[PDB]
Design a protein around this nucleic acid. Sequence first.
DNA 1: TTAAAAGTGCATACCGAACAAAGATAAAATT
DNA 2: AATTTTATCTCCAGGCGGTATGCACTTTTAA
Lengths: 968, 317
Amino acid sequence: QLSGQQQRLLAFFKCCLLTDQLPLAHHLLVVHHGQRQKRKLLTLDMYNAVMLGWARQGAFKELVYVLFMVKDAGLTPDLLSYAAALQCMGRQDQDAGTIERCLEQMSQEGLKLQALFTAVLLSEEDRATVLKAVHKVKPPVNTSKLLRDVYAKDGRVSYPKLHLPLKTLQCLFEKQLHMELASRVCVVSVEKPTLPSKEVKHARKTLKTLRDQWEKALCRALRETKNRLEREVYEGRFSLYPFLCLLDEREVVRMLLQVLQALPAQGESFTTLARELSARTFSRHVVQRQRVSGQVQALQNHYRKYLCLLASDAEVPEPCLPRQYWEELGAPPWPLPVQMELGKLLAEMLVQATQMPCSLDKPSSRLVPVLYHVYSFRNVQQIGILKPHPAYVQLLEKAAEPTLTFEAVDVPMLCPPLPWTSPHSGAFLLSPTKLMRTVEGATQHQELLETCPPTALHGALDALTQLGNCAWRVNGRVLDLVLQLFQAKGCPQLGVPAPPSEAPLAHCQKVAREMHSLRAEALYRLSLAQHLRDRVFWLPHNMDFRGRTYPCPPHFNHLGSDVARALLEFAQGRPLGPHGLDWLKIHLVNLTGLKKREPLRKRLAFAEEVMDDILDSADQPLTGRKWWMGAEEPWQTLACCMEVANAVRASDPAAYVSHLPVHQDGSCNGLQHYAALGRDSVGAASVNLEPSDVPQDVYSGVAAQVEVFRRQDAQRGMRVAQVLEGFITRKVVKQTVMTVVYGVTRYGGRLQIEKRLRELSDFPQEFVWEASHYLVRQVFKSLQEMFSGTRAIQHWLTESARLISHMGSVVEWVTPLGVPVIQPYRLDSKVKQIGGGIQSITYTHNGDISRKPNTRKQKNGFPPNFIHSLDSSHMMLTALHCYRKGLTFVSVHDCYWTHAADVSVMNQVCREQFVRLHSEPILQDLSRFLVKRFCSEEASQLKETLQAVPKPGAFDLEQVKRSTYFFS
Amino acid sequence: FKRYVTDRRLAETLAQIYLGKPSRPPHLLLECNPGPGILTQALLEAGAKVVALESDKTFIPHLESLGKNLDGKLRVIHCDFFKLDPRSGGVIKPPAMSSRGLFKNLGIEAVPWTADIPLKVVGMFPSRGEKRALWKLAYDLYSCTSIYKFGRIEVNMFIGEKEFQKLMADPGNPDLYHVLSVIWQLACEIKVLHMEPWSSFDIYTRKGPELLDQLQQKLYLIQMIPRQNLFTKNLTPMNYNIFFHLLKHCFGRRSATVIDHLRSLTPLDARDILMQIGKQEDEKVVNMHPQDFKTLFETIERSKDCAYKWLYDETLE
DNA sequence: TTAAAAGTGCATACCGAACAAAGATAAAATT
DNA sequence: AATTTTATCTCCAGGCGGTATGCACTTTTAA
């Protein structure tokens, strides 16, 4: 229904409403209504927006005229059309006869005046004005079974508090609000400690003069473009004048200068510069709109009152979850074509307006563009690239600017996140953040999130809130060493990338390109860490389209590499107590990875065995035995050994307070859920889901079965086996089996087995094709024997997804918590493109519900998506039930972190929630939901595929509680 | 698929154009995909040193027995010209044999580019991979590696009608004038030696001995001998990537002027560069002669006083 | 006055190639 | 039915660009 021109005109009308350019919108509406063909584009929504814009001004005759046009067009006015007229009078102070007539006219529709308030999403000021005009004449709690215990007030609750005073928290909130209003963050650069020279001074002076010339040129270009688009408006044509009048001229100039300095020396695609410029424009628009509308003050007061809940000294009449307290205390986009067109115009204005001397070497007579438009060819296709002038790049690297620049969202918050009271509001104070990360035009996830019953989503939202409330801080002693390595020499074996200046010809150049990318990510993440070394910071969280949770700041979080997780540590602290030091040592051993097969007792003993190395590494991380670099994760092990040494060198280990996190990873979590759903007996014992004295590794079990098959075949005198002699190991077959949850097939696994064999020098190359074909079927038969319910579940899920896609609809399901999930896979058949002078951008209309479902990608993603949704549900349940007992809890998708003294407590619920999570009939409920949704309207095959659920195995789930290595 | 001759008269007519064209005895022939070997019989009764290069191992025994029975010079090396010298992998499957080893066991060695021709390569182009093979040959020739590593070698091959027209396209025929035409015509003196109707050959599929359109599609036997002065001071095998990018860019917008493409491709003054080559500013791309492209590239590359000349840093891929 | 050449709007096809591949196999596409 | 074709491992934010072609209409221009 939404055509290309219709969306653009509708957005134009709303933008004119936002910037109060009512004469322009009225003129354009008149022009479109004048022509017969051009009139059909207009719809009732456009008229309603135009008249609502006039209502805020109080011009009643304009409303009369637009109502006359609506009546002439044959469109029937709706409730909002009368609501605009009603709210106009309240500001205009008209006579009661008009109100009586307007109220009586609604009798044709029949809905009452309060029905007007309920049905129409009028603004609060609009609601008040409508109430004033009409006066002339005339929290729930979720009751789900799984979340009943979390939201029940009756019982014992020990919700924790922050460690900071209320005054300090309010000061930090003021700082965060100011930083977000400025919308930029300036960070000193960790690289280039100092460069005193004449040439750097000359480069800085030239750069400053160039930047002045560019800002003036871009101001003139902005003015000329605005005049051009205005004169196109006056010719009865669509344009983007209001979308350029939303922000100040100087703000857009600062925007474009920042984006230009953010362009890498290797260029960037036009469709990327278009997408990012539009997104930044929208963010600045919403921030400025909230600033001028006055909601900043309302948020400031509400937040200053709400901070008493989390403050240490402060208290509340009744402790509650932060969402509930926020609600009780008093609760205070553009279509994709428009966004794409707006970005291209800014990008073109940037490329055209800017100019630089061709020769900066000495005192060129001509000026050349800074950015060039080139083509990059990939097979038959081509890509537009905006590449900087190489002289400008040389000037940038010669200048050695001491300060980077970060967007507001990129830097971690300096104040606690806003509660996730609704999909619309949450996370950042002012900047917009969507709950489910997806593509820009995608609006089928938020639609389901908003249309769900308000109570159902609560369990998800609260969980995210807790994950955002967890404080953090930077480990100083680890960061000093990382900075020392990064600045001088680097250490690629450890993880610190080597500098570009040092030696790493075409192979040399490819190595140089990867190393430069890694060094750039490191300057961004180490600069952020250096900036936040003395400040407590928070990280908001948001979901993906399935249910997993990710931090919002991408450049610096706990989902990163070894250094990222090494620097972070809890800002608060807890005393070690009785069992804290044991868990610290077990965590150290787990990070080393040497004792993966041993029981907890053996790891604890081994930690005491090598204590001398731990002390020497902690005391002299770079001038001692340097044992810590031998671990699987060197930096995390260094941090853990430093913490353990500080704990054991204290007067009393039980009184020592430790900020270091401790991880309890799951064992093959995807298989752990396959086994639970299928009640697999042999598989459960393999995945540590059944109690045992020694951990059971699936990887080594598969390798052992493959080796047994190899010996059996070698006993038959077959050359393929005879070639293999001890070559089968968990290293060879780990990658093949870990992706079985992802749905890998024999073809895919063969490539990874070949890759693993390739490093193995002992193995003869001639047998690679035959061996890979052998090992593939051996591994697959091993998994079929160990995991049969897994295969049945995967087959049933894939078949149901394939039939659903064949029926013409995408696959959607409800998680056990209550969150609904829809799959974003559709076919890009019709091409969408926008014509521009520089280049014609090819874009995908992400929000097209008319596109046909993509059956391959739909049926090839259903099982892993379902497993990730269940994993997220389990994580949320454990997070909430840990919060109920005063637990700090942050999780990397299955790796639950907690304080050292608290680890055991987490385990006690981490298992228990699992036991109840699968206690509900997940598969039968999924089948019932899919039958009700996709089969209530060839349907026999779909109904039979969904009605036949695999029969559960023979297993008692309650024994997961006594399992010692379920999560370790 | 592939096709081989099934008529005595056609093989006889091919014999003299293949062997008597070089009046010099010592030219050996590196024949590709002999098939049954009737053409090899014609070339053997012609007396040439026919080195059969059979793609598979199926028909090697017959040809080898024929060559050895009369002590004839018919060495059926198991290799294919299509898969010759594959970059992927380190272990080479015998059907895809490295060029160095094939030439070492063959007995031929390297000669200077300015020197004379070492040998001649004959056969027929792949039925559906003509563009691919042409691009591979062009890349090898301009990079001075693979077959052309040892010296300039004629490639006397049958090619389809459409590919031949696209190869021989000129600025006088801008409909099909593309980058392949320029890159080949700057290097090889392409001349049609023979033209035949494809119904004469027999197509031997995977099982054994579209289709009608192919039969009616006349095949042109084309000879490609690399030019003596292709590589110059400025156009070198190291710089051929920039030239390839320039040619592929200038045909991205065929209905455009060279002066605007120069701005996208170089920071130098477009008008000043166009003045050196004696061309007007308002010159379309499709009106540029293949020699004019090389002259433009060499003119750009000869900037005496500047530090930057190009925007192809290999970052573009 | 009346008819039209010129122009604007949309979809819609068609073109442009480096760089092996060795089997299996199963659904989907083609016949 | 039945030969060919083509994909073959989930997510964490993603798409070729140009030229010619026809259509269906408004619009500046012909007498």
